[PDB]
Amino acid sequence: SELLVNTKSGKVMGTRVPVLSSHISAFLGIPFAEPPVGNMRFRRPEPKKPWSGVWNASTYPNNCQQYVDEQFPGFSGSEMWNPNREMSEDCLYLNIWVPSPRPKSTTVMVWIYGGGFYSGSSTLDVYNGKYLAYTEEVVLVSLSYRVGAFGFLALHGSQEAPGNVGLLDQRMALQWVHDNIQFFGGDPKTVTIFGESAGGASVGMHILSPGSRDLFRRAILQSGSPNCPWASVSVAEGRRRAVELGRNLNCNLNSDEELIHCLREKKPQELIDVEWNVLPFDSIFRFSFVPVIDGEFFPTSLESMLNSGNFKKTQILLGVNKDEGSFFLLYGAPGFSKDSESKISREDFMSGVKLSVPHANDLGLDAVTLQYTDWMDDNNGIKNRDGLDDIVGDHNVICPLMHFVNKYTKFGNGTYLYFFNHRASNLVWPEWMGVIHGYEIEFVFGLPLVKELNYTAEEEALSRRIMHYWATFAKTGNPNEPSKWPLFTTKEQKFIDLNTEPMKVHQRLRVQMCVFWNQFLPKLLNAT
Amino acid sequence: SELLVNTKSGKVMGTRVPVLSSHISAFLGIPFAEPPVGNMRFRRPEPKKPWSGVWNASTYPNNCQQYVDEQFPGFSGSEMWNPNREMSEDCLYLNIWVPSPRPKSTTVMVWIYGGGFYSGSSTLDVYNGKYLAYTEEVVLVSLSYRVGAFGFLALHGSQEAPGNVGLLDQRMALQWVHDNIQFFGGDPKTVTIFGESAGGASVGMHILSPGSRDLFRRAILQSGSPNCPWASVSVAEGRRRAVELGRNLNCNLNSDEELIHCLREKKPQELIDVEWNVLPFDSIFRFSFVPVIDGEFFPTSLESMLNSGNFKKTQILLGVNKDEGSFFLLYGAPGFSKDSESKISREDFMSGVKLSVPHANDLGLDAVTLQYTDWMDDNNGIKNRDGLDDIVGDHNVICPLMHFVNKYTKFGNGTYLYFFNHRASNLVWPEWMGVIHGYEIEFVFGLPLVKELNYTAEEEALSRRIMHYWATFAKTGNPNEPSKWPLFTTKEQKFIDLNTEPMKVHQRLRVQMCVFWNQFLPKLLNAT
Ligand SMILES: c1ccc2c(NCCCCCCCNc3c4c(nc5ccccc35)CCCC4)c3c(nc2c1)CCCC3
Ligand SMILES: c1ccc2c(NCCCCCCCNc3c4c(nc5ccccc35)CCCC4)c3c(nc2c1)CCCC3
Ligand SMILES: *[C@@H]1O[C@H](CO)[C@@H](O)[C@H](O)[C@H]1NC(C)=O
Ligand SMILES: *[C@@H]1O[C@H](CO)[C@@H](O)[C@H](O)[C@H]1NC(C)=O
Ligand SMILES: *[C@@H]1O[C@H](CO)[C@@H](O)[C@H](O)[C@H]1NC(C)=O
Ligand SMILES: *[C@@H]1O[C@H](CO)[C@@H](O)[C@H](O)[C@H]1NC(C)=O
């Protein structure tokens, strides 16, 4: 039977699912780790003990314990990112969509979800792998991983809560794909890991981590990179946050053992209820529990690793959206609201830059403000809104990614860069937010192919284009079928726009601003 | 007789001069001070002792001792600024052009020449007052003043070489105009002082100095302002340069008296031969002997005087040219030459910014470079040439003037701002230099009215326009005859272009760059 597969860990039974009036098989909720519960919380994951009998893989698994966004109750725009399954600490599962009939040895794609390392689920509707699996004849895998404190509480030196365990959850699911995807028709010599936001940062982290490099072939990073200012912290900062988390729950703070033991007796929701209270600064686009530069998962600082070529050398395809920042200003900056055009005053602009570059002194805040202000029209509410939007996006997503691509390209075997700037026709978010963080995903997963979702015909055409680029690149290391997406080189630095208009090639993506964020500002904050 | 005038110091005999096929009287070389020679060198000027008999004022006087530019021998472009009379320390004279028939009580204009406080003459052909005197029915005066070490050697505390004596020469000639211009038909209640470059800075200095304020009514500043970075130094820096001047002549350096006595036994040319060796940095647009903030001529720092309204409150008319910087790069920056288009390499660009902002550390030099570099086209030789040109002009002329106008306007009684960007048709300098420092003077003095000088008819029309604005403003405090040059206000900040095209009004002259030069860079150099 097509829905029964014997793996090294046991047999799993899938279910047949309909897709654009055809069908493919889906194996949902396959376990790849022992439930990280009880004394296991905060700890490195353990491989799932083999089982006898047949595992029922016909329904989605629980999503990991996470903060639930309640800003716009029932609003689909934000509801679409929240968990759509009961949450549970028992959440280490993976999902597989397999073309039908079952392939023999085809291209594999492993999706790693974003959500700032504090949230995220593999079961969201925009992450439904059936359309891509089906349209491109690829075996699609979506893994899961512990987020929030459960995944990233870091007390370096201790072995009970070492940090980075959520990264290790990902690595384990990747080890499982490596060990068992052959039974589902997947070629393990050809797996592409791809992810968005924290997922895109994660992908880059596996490219850097020696212990992860051999478990995959190629990589795709969407609006995220490992060196993002919000994606990692030092062991000292990780320690200070774990301790403050402890102080918020009236835990005994005399030893790592006392702290950890106390954190383990707490219900999941108690940790989530105070998670945000440990951030050191008033900020926007910063998360409490994230990966730590520990000397193990990351042997040295990310920058020295990038400088010395200390990373997996292969091909990569990556990019950013036009307005990465709008979503974070809506959520935490004064003057922005979902139902107005959000014209910002100079005062709110300035409190906006303070929030956006939390780690900056007055001279640095003055440098950002001068760089983004049109002084012939300083009180233009729309220019202030838009400037703040670019500040958030440039600093948090775009410029860190450009610094990663330029460092990678000096040693890699091929880079393809994209700029996604299509504002979808059925977007339910206000116009001022533009091409939002996360809104290229639906095109990558091919949602515009389903009529009922109201996209235009040209949007369906763009989706097919992107899906075919993503899968052709996963299969060959080049998105083009043998109109060309030029290779990004150290010299020319070419990239493409990804929208419904005819393809245009440009060069040096936001160089002007990125020289400021990658070379000038860091130097300024170092001298003063 | 029309050419004989009795003044409080004695009788002077002028000469009749032809002007655009008419005639006016000229009194040249009238003395207003005792020759500052021998033991008088470096000292405050003494009023000229009255004489009996008739002073022959029919020919130009000697020009003060100064460095003579020999870069382009015989080239008119640069030759036109060099002394056209024998040089002599006996040079404190003034010149008067009087309409004919002699007026009774008309508007007076007193010209103060530029030349970086180290050079300059009142007798240059572009400074010929007959055209303006004649066309606008104004009594035109051009004064002279000691330059170089002779005018600005500063050993604060000593009374033999106190500093600022060249400023005091100007003040004395102004006291003479106040005391005697009535006999030439001039109204002393209505004298406008106007000057260019160091002359424009000088004008602003008399506006600030309590001891000069009562000697004039209105002021015009062309491409220069008192707060320019090259127009003044502290008493300590002035002292260090006087001492180094001394060290260059093997003078005894044990006391001010020993130093001064030694400097006084030296021939004029010995001082000029080593004048440039005392500059502290390798620089462009910096001069050795300039005014000092001494607590006497300037009671406190220029900025605190500007902040508190401590200055003469009246009307002012001022402006800058499009390419103030080109001339100084031609003379001292690598890669520029008179006979080539001067496309600059990145290396020369960078050595150019170091020369232009001599007082800056590495972080500051990086800030200037980022502000003026198009990073999508960093190796464009023309963009590098042009960027360096704006850097010199913005930092040395334009942004200091805009900071002065904005501070002045908060207390003054009327401001009129201009931007001169007409490239004259007969210019002998290469195209790349644009609208050069000093090339608006010929229009102010009306040289385009004389056919033989080859200007176009529209250039003649512009000259008449400017002359009429300058004189109407000197007579009334407003350049418009009762198409309007709007008043520059603290709120609107309006200004006009001054060229052959129809008048256009704009706002906030180079705000973007001036916020960088007036507010950001100074703060950055202060913190680091
Ligand atoms: C843990 C985490 C956050 C917390 C928090 N604010 C922060 C709440 C932010 C909720 C946004 C939902 C994400 N949802 C989104 C995603 C994407 N795009 C989006 C685009 C638009 C809107 C939401 C998006 C791309 C993929 C990743 C997910 C706060 C608190 N606790 C927290 C405890 C206590 C009260 C103060 C605020
Ligand atoms: C004293 C002063 C300068 C010296 C110097 N370099 C510097 C020499 C510069 C000569 C330029 C002539 C001005 N002449 C000019 C003026 C205007 N515009 C111009 C526009 C173009 C060209 C010249 C101009 C506007 C009004 C003011 C005058 C040097 C030395 N000594 C000096 C000793 C020793 C050798 C090294 C160079
Ligand atoms: C698998 O689980 C689902 C959902 O709980 C159930 O409806 C289905 O019948 C199960 N199949 C088997 C054979 O266990
Ligand atoms: C990738 O590597 C192959 C073989 O090692 C080499 O021939 C090819 O040029 C490389 N491609 C790029 C873009 O570096
Ligand atoms: C004035 O001086 C000039 C030049 O030296 C001379 O030619 C002229 O005749 C003189 N006039 C008188 C009366 O001194
Ligand atoms: C100048 O002063 C006069 C009288 O003191 C005043 O009425 C007028 O408004 C002033 N003009 C400006 C532009 O300040």
Side-chain angles (χ1 to χ4, degrees), chain A residues 1-3 5-15 17-38 40-48 50-85 87-188 190-256 258-260 262-264 266 268-295 297-342 344-346 348-361 363-409 411-430 432-450 452-490 492-500 502-503 505-518 520-528, chain B residues 1-3 5-15 17-38 40-48 50-85 87-188 190-256 258-260 262-264 266 268-295 297-342 344-346 348-361 363-409 411-430 432-450 452-490 492-500 502-503 505-518 520-528:
Chain A
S1 179
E2 199 169 68
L3 308 180
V5 173
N6 191 25
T7 71
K8 294 159 174 183
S9 296
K11 295 168 142 132
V12 297
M13 182 62 222
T15 165
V17 315
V19 212
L20 300 174
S21 73
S22 185
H23 310 268
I24 54 77
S25 327
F27 296 83
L28 318 175
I30 289 174
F32 62 77
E34 280 301 298
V37 306
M40 310 240 83
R41 173 182 295 170
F42 306 132
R43 171 154 13 189
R44 292 193 176 175
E46 250 34 75
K48 173 69 167 173
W51 59 83
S52 40
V54 173
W55 188 287
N56 192 343
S58 68
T59 66
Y60 278 142
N62 302 310
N63 306 145
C64 297
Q65 289 283 179
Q66 53 188 280
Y67 185 75
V68 172
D69 174 33
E70 278 170 57
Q71 254 288 203
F72 309 107
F75 180 56
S76 60
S78 61
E79 211 64 83
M80 79 183 266
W81 306 106
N82 276 328
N84 62 346
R85 298 266 129 180
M87 288 182 282
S88 180
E89 273 185 281
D90 183 342
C91 61
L92 295 187
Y93 300 81
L94 57 79
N95 311 298
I96 321 185
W97 282 268
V98 177
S100 172
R102 189 188 299 172
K104 305 307 178 178
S105 201
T106 192
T107 303
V108 183
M109 297 189 72
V110 182
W111 176 248
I112 304 185
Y113 64 66
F117 292 114
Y118 71 81
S119 66
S121 300
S122 74
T123 61
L124 305 186
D125 300 331
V126 268
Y127 297 158
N128 196 328
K130 82 195 194 175
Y131 308 105
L132 186 56
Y134 176 73
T135 310
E136 300 294 322
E137 175 69 359
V138 306
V139 161
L140 189 86
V141 176
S142 54
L143 54 69
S144 63
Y145 62 99
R146 278 173 287 170
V147 297
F150 311 88
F152 300 93
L153 181 80
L155 286 167
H156 192 55
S158 130
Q159 284 309 323
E160 288 309 333
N164 294 336
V165 309
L167 281 172
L168 295 175
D169 295 339
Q170 296 170 16
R171 177 186 292 165
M172 190 138 99
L174 288 173
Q175 184 70 55
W176 196 92
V177 164
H178 179 270
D179 296 339
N180 301 277
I181 208 70
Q182 69 199 79
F183 306 117
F184 294 89
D187 173 12
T190 308
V191 353
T192 294
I193 50 169
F194 74 134
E196 186 267 351
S197 212
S202 288
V203 162
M205 279 167 179
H206 290 299
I207 278 163
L208 288 152
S209 191
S212 297
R213 307 178 190 171
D214 307 342
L215 304 176
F216 66 94
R217 176 70 168 281
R218 284 193 255 287
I220 291 173
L221 301 81
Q222 299 166 219
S223 309
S225 62
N227 58 312
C228 277
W230 49 267
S232 66
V233 297
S234 64
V235 291
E237 176 56 7
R239 168 164 291 286
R240 189 229 114 223
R241 303 179 181 190
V243 168
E244 187 68 4
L245 182 66
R247 187 168 302 171
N248 266 264
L249 297 167
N250 310 292
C251 282
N252 178 300
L253 321 188
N254 289 332
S255 56
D256 284 358
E258 288 265 32
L259 176 49
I260 293 171
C262 175
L263 290 172
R264 285 186 181 156
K266 298 296 188 174
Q269 199 50 227
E270 287 173 85
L271 263 35
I272 295 171
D273 281 349
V274 303
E275 195 178 325
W276 239 227
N277 301 347
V278 314
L279 277 172
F281 317 108
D282 187 5
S283 59
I284 227 63
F285 220 133
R286 291 297 186 272
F287 316 115
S288 299
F289 299 96
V290 295
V292 277
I293 311 306
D294 66 350
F297 193 100
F298 302 107
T300 62
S301 75
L302 300 181
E303 183 57 26
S304 67
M305 283 189 77
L306 289 170
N307 269 316
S308 65
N310 192 4
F311 51 80
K312 179 187 189 65
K313 278 92 173 205
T314 182
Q315 306 82 29
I316 55 166
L317 178 153
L318 70 180
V320 303
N321 300 347
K322 191 175 134 276
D323 309 291
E324 301 286 3
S326 67
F327 144 66
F328 304 79
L329 293 153
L330 172 59
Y331 279 66
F336 295 85
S337 0
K338 175 176 144 316
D339 300 347
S340 82
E341 271 184 348
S342 295
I344 302 302
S345 73
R346 281 309 281 172
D348 282 352
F349 179 80
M350 283 184 305
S351 55
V353 345
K354 186 47 188 168
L355 250 15
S356 302
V357 185
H359 61 280
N361 53 29
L363 180 71
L365 291 170
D366 279 359
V368 171
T369 300
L370 176 68
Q371 197 73 186
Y372 285 88
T373 296
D374 174 355
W375 295 97
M376 312 202 78
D377 198 3
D378 56 305
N379 276 298
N380 173 330
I382 289 184
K383 269 162 165 178
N384 288 343
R385 182 195 67 200
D386 292 347
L388 211 26
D389 191 344
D390 291 327
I391 286 167
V392 172
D394 291 345
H395 169 62
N396 288 293
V397 177
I398 306 189
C399 295
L401 185 139
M402 294 303 302
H403 174 80
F404 170 83
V405 63
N406 278 291
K407 288 293 189 176
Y408 191 85
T409 295
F411 295 96
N413 186 239
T415 303
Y416 296 86
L417 185 63
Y418 76 77
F419 185 72
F420 180 87
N421 59 349
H422 179 73
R423 160 85 183 189
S425 64
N426 48 13
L427 208 80
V428 302
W429 292 99
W432 75 259
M433 292 177 73
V435 191
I436 307 173
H437 190 58
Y439 285 76
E440 89 290 355
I441 295 185
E442 55 203 53
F443 286 80
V444 165
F445 281 73
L447 284 285
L449 301 204
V450 341
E452 309 71 87
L453 294 183
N454 309 334
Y455 289 84
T456 68
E458 26 286 298
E459 288 181 332
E460 190 203 334
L462 175 53
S463 185
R464 284 174 178 289
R465 265 254 298 320
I466 286 164
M467 285 196 286
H468 194 56
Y469 287 145
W470 263 221
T472 298
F473 163 89
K475 171 166 141 277
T476 75
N478 176 353
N480 302 290
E481 190 75 68
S483 210
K484 313 304 149 178
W485 182 338
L487 195 51
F488 169 100
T489 65
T490 293
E492 261 40 43
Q493 300 172 45
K494 307 194 184 171
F495 69 94
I496 65 165
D497 288 321
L498 225 39
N499 54 46
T500 59
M503 188 200 273
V505 171
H506 310 280
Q507 298 174 284
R508 297 181 180 185
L509 178 42
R510 286 183 77 61
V511 241
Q512 200 64 43
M513 293 303 91
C514 291
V515 165
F516 171 85
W517 294 101
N518 297 332
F520 183 74
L521 186 62
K523 195 167 165 194
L524 177 157
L525 297 169
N526 195 74
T528 65
Chain B
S1 179
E2 199 169 68
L3 308 180
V5 173
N6 191 25
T7 71
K8 294 159 174 183
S9 296
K11 295 168 142 132
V12 297
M13 182 62 222
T15 165
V17 315
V19 212
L20 300 174
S21 73
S22 185
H23 310 268
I24 54 77
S25 327
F27 296 83
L28 318 175
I30 289 174
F32 62 77
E34 280 301 298
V37 306
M40 310 240 83
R41 173 182 295 170
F42 306 132
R43 171 155 13 189
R44 292 193 176 175
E46 250 34 75
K48 173 69 167 173
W51 59 83
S52 40
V54 173
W55 188 287
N56 192 343
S58 68
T59 66
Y60 278 142
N62 302 310
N63 306 145
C64 297
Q65 289 283 179
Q66 53 188 280
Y67 185 75
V68 172
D69 174 32
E70 278 170 57
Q71 254 288 203
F72 309 107
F75 180 56
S76 60
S78 61
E79 211 64 83
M80 79 183 266
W81 306 106
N82 276 328
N84 62 346
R85 298 266 129 180
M87 288 182 282
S88 180
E89 273 185 281
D90 183 342
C91 61
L92 295 187
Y93 300 81
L94 57 79
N95 311 298
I96 321 185
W97 282 268
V98 177
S100 172
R102 189 188 299 172
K104 305 307 178 178
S105 201
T106 192
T107 303
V108 183
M109 297 189 72
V110 182
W111 176 248
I112 304 185
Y113 64 66
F117 292 114
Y118 71 81
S119 66
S121 300
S122 74
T123 61
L124 305 186
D125 300 331
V126 268
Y127 297 158
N128 196 328
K130 82 195 194 175
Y131 308 105
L132 186 56
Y134 176 73
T135 310
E136 300 294 322
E137 175 69 359
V138 306
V139 161
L140 189 86
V141 176
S142 54
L143 54 69
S144 63
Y145 62 99
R146 278 173 287 170
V147 297
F150 311 88
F152 300 93
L153 181 80
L155 286 167
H156 192 55
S158 130
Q159 284 309 323
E160 288 309 333
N164 294 336
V165 309
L167 281 172
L168 295 175
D169 295 339
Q170 296 170 16
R171 177 186 292 165
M172 190 138 99
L174 288 173
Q175 184 70 55
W176 196 92
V177 164
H178 179 270
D179 296 339
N180 301 277
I181 208 70
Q182 69 199 79
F183 306 117
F184 294 89
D187 173 12
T190 308
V191 353
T192 294
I193 50 169
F194 74 134
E196 186 267 351
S197 212
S202 288
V203 162
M205 279 167 179
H206 290 299
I207 278 163
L208 288 152
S209 191
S212 297
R213 307 178 190 171
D214 307 342
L215 304 176
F216 66 94
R217 176 70 168 281
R218 284 193 255 287
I220 291 173
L221 301 81
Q222 299 166 219
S223 309
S225 62
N227 58 312
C228 277
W230 49 267
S232 66
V233 297
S234 64
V235 291
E237 176 56 7
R239 168 164 291 286
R240 189 229 114 223
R241 303 179 181 190
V243 168
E244 187 68 4
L245 182 66
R247 187 168 302 171
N248 266 264
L249 297 167
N250 310 292
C251 282
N252 178 300
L253 321 188
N254 289 332
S255 56
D256 284 358
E258 288 265 32
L259 176 49
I260 293 171
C262 175
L263 290 172
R264 285 186 181 156
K266 298 296 188 174
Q269 199 50 227
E270 287 173 85
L271 263 35
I272 295 171
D273 281 349
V274 303
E275 195 178 325
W276 239 227
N277 301 347
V278 314
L279 277 172
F281 317 108
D282 187 5
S283 59
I284 227 63
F285 220 133
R286 291 297 186 272
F287 316 115
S288 299
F289 299 96
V290 295
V292 277
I293 311 306
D294 66 350
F297 193 100
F298 302 107
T300 62
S301 75
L302 300 181
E303 183 57 26
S304 67
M305 283 189 77
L306 289 170
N307 269 316
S308 65
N310 192 4
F311 51 80
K312 179 187 189 65
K313 278 92 173 205
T314 182
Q315 306 82 29
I316 55 166
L317 178 153
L318 70 180
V320 303
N321 300 347
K322 191 175 134 276
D323 309 291
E324 301 286 3
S326 67
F327 144 66
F328 304 79
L329 293 153
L330 172 59
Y331 279 66
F336 295 85
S337 0
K338 175 176 144 316
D339 300 347
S340 82
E341 271 184 348
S342 295
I344 302 302
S345 73
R346 281 309 281 172
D348 282 352
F349 179 80
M350 283 184 305
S351 55
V353 345
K354 186 47 188 168
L355 250 15
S356 302
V357 185
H359 61 280
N361 53 29
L363 180 71
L365 291 170
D366 279 359
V368 171
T369 300
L370 176 68
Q371 197 73 186
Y372 285 88
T373 296
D374 174 355
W375 295 97
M376 312 202 78
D377 198 3
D378 56 305
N379 276 298
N380 173 330
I382 289 184
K383 269 162 165 178
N384 288 343
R385 182 195 67 200
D386 292 347
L388 211 26
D389 191 344
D390 291 327
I391 286 167
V392 172
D394 291 345
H395 169 62
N396 288 293
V397 177
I398 306 189
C399 295
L401 185 139
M402 294 303 302
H403 174 80
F404 170 83
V405 63
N406 278 291
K407 288 293 189 176
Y408 191 85
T409 295
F411 295 96
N413 186 239
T415 303
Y416 296 86
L417 185 63
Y418 76 77
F419 185 72
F420 180 87
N421 59 349
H422 179 73
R423 160 85 183 189
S425 64
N426 48 13
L427 208 80
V428 302
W429 292 99
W432 75 259
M433 292 177 73
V435 191
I436 307 173
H437 190 58
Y439 285 76
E440 89 290 355
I441 295 185
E442 55 203 53
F443 286 80
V444 165
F445 281 73
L447 284 285
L449 301 204
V450 341
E452 309 71 87
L453 294 183
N454 309 334
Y455 289 84
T456 68
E458 26 286 298
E459 288 181 332
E460 190 203 334
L462 175 53
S463 185
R464 284 174 178 289
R465 265 254 298 320
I466 286 164
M467 285 196 286
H468 194 56
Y469 287 145
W470 263 221
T472 298
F473 163 89
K475 171 166 141 277
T476 75
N478 176 353
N480 302 290
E481 190 75 68
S483 210
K484 313 304 149 178
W485 182 338
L487 195 51
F488 169 100
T489 65
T490 293
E492 261 40 43
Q493 300 173 45
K494 307 194 184 171
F495 69 94
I496 65 165
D497 288 321
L498 225 39
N499 54 46
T500 59
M503 188 200 273
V505 171
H506 310 280
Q507 298 174 284
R508 297 181 180 185
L509 178 42
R510 286 183 77 61
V511 241
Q512 200 64 43
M513 293 303 91
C514 291
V515 165
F516 171 85
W517 294 101
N518 297 332
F520 183 74
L521 186 62
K523 195 167 165 194
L524 177 157
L525 297 169
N526 195 74
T528 65

